[model samples]
Target chain A: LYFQGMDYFRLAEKFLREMHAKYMKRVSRPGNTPRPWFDFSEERLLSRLFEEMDELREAVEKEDWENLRDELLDVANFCMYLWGKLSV
Target chain B: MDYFRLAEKFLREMHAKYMKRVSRPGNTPRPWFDFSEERLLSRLFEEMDELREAVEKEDWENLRDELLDVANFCMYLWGKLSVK
Candidate 1:
């Protein structure tokens, strides 16, 4: 029943949208180009994931909910991105 | 530079310790009780909610524990999907 529900899917979609904007901002910078997740090896992606997790840990340690939420989203995005590569 | 090397190491150690504690006999088994992704996702969401509760209550200790549980669920889900 929980899996059949839309709440998680909805929340996940929102996060994805937020990530899209974040990605856009990065690539919008002068001389910056979009680097799709598929362009990187799985190992590289995982390294990024670990780095994001570290940021998450830092945010938690500092009790900064704002930064923690951002890091959490980053970590989630990296996990899904890695999964996509593996699935392919 | 290894900007977050210390943080990464800390998390890795914490995760390893947590996994060992949970996997001991009389606790959770290696393969886990259920392989159903739906059930696992539901449980993960529950843990996420608990993490949120800890954050709201400003319970740093509980927050750390709940965060580890959330990460464990991600690892569990990944392992299940990897073999399928």
Candidate 2:
């Protein structure tokens, strides 16, 4: 997870796109906000996304499975599409 | 310019942000939990924007300092909400 590191933008972009498919998109949404900044301001979103991405990676590297599970679960629940799809 | 100085500056900035809003009856009396995940996440986003701006401006001098600031900030905030 944390075996060295690279630039934030590319890292975050790849992670989010992967998360979008694997986790189904909570990693990509703004919960219940309208006109979310992330939807339009990719530059800003990448910045914040990188913060979360590395935090998650660090947790995994440390074997902080407790936190990792929570982050993973949050990734599942926070996305409306996934929850809706699951409910349906 | 220097990394230590930037980190120190950021520490003060973060501390001020925390203190003004989450800390103290120095002015506004407290009547709630001193901290919350939402507040912290919002702050993270703000710090993140600052970091991005620095990079966009090609201010390599502040880059590592900001990255370190973000790394610590992100992990700390995650540990806060990233429940066991």
Candidate 3:
């Protein structure tokens, strides 16, 4: 099962693309324009990150399938998104 | 390349250009890649949760920021575990 023809890159990209599409809807919507940036910094980022992980720790086993997908998708989506921004 | 491989490659390029310049006037030293596996993964998981929050709250702005850091920690994990 492990590393037996697994396409993790594509697997990750699939979710990323899905998330991208979903986010695009909000971005394109005319009424409530979203800010492109936030109060960006290491401390705030780290604090928020810790908070999220704690939730995952709590939610992983107890939540429903859809909720699990939601949890994991958010995490995966963010990583892919940021990597793209900083990569350039 | 593999997804993780790509992650490793980009993180290298990023660190050379950006992380190399990381500095805080009074903060303690920063290691370009320093963390126990558990600690780093812990942070990575945190990013995922933030993403979930953004979805729940419908906060696109915070979602974008969280995404950046999540990807960053991911590559850091890849770099630490991979062979040189």
Maximum-DockQ candidate: 3
Clashes of each: 0, 0, 5
lDDT by residue for model 1 (A1-88), tens: 3442233233333444555555566657764335535567766865676677667667656867455555655665555444444444
CAPRI docking class of candidate 3: incorrect
Candidate number 2, chain A TM-score: 0.39
State the C-alpha lDDT per candidate.
0.52, 0.42, 0.46
All candidates' TM-scores? Answer: 0.46, 0.34, 0.38
Clashes of 1: 0
Per-residue CA lDDT of candidate 2, range B1-84, in tens?
222333334344433443444344452211112346556555555665776686789775665455444443453354445432
Q: Which consecutive 10 residues in model 1 chain B have the weakest lDDT in total?
A: B1-10
The reply for model 1, stretches above 4 Å from the true place, is A1-4, A28-33, B1-84
Model 2 lDDT per residue over A1-88, tens place: 5422222233333333333344334334655332222232434444444545566557667867566644543322222221122222
lDDT at B76 for candidate 2?
39
lDDT of 3 by residue, B42-82 (tens): 76667666766875786766755655555545544443344
- Candidate 3: C-alpha RMSD to true structure equals 11.8
Clashing pairs in 3: A53-B46, A75-B48, A78-B67, A79-B71, A82-B68
CAPRI band of model 1? Answer: incorrect
